[PDB]
A = this chain, B = another copy of it.
Amino acid sequence: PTAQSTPLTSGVNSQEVPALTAVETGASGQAVPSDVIETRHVVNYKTRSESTLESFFGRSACVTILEVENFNATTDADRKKQFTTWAITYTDTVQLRRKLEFFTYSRFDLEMTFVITERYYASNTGHARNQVYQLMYIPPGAPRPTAWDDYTWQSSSNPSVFYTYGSAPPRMSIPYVGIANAYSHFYDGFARVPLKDETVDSGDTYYGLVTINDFGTLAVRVVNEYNPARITSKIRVYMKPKHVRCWCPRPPRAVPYRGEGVDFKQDSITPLTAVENINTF
């Protein structure tokens, strides 16, 4: 299937007036060049292959950067650097989020890929043996780790991936896991109805998708015990929507995001650069 060919047409002198319409109806303009000019025949062999939803979304996009370290931790703050937990979301970054938010609802499977990098914190503290990472998916309700070596990492039921530093970026597929018939990119509502004369706080409650969304937690650790040399790591998380369906198109984000909601920032709501004149080519 190709984009439209142009038919051979000459002029008209007619009560047929395809150049005029009434967009008050809610219909866009429909006229094509053959309606308003003399056209040659042009066979169009070109296709819209690369603007299908699968083609538009068919990319692994970075959605977050996590940090973990491996060293002899002697304080609570340093013990908390030996592992990390991240509430799974696409709102830490802007690029994939903006593409998804062309749509109100979506349904897709997810390819998740990870890029893991290290550096030495210091020299003259010797070296570090090659590190193994555990990335554990903690679904909502499953116990979250409070230490890098607590019982939760035995991961009998939670999916974990063990990644060996220097190996190919690890990767797995996630089904469409939504508890609705599609994912909502926007939710104009609340998690509960506040009722007449109830004592429950109404002063510090939130609004929209943040009140109802929960895709669980990614927990990451270095499995190795500490070397004399402190190693610091970054884990970049990549998402590719595949087997994609989307519904109810939206205008795209025109101004910077300032969090997980649709809120905008007072110093960043002037996207257009003023033209010198309405008559500027």
CB of A47 within 8 A of chain B? no
Tell me which of B120, B132, B154, B229 contacts A93 (CB under 8 A). B154
What mask results when residues 149 to 190 of chain A are scored 1 for a CB within 8 Å of chain B, else 0? 001011111111010111111000000000000000000000
Q: Decide if A227 touches B119 in the complex (CB within 8 Å).
A: yes
CB of A226 within 8 A of chain B? yes
Q: Decide if A168 touches B164 in the complex (CB within 8 Å).
A: yes
Q: Decide if B117 touches A156 in the complex (CB within 8 Å).
A: no
Tell me which of B229, B232, B236 contacts A223 (CB under 8 A). B236
Q: Decide if B154 touches A95 in the complex (CB within 8 Å).
A: yes
Instruction: List, in ascending order, chain B residues with CB within 8 A of A228's CB.
Output: 120, 122-123
Instruction: List, in ascending order, chain B residues with CB within 8 A of A224's CB.
Output: 117-119, 234
Instruction: List, in ascending order, chain B residues with CB within 8 A of A62's CB.
Output: 153-156
| CB proximity to B under 8 Å, residues A51-68 | 59-63
CB distance from A86 to the nearest CB of B (A): 15
Would you mind naming 29 contact pairs between A and B with Cβ atoms under 8 Å apart?
Answer: A59-B158, A59-B159, A61-B155, A61-B156, A63-B154, A70-B119, A93-B151, A95-B154, A95-B157, A96-B154, A96-B156, A115-B132, A117-B225, A119-B128, A119-B226, A119-B227, A120-B127, A120-B129, A120-B228, A123-B125, A123-B126, A123-B127, A123-B228, A123-B229, A162-B169, A164-B168, A165-B166, A166-B166, A224-B234
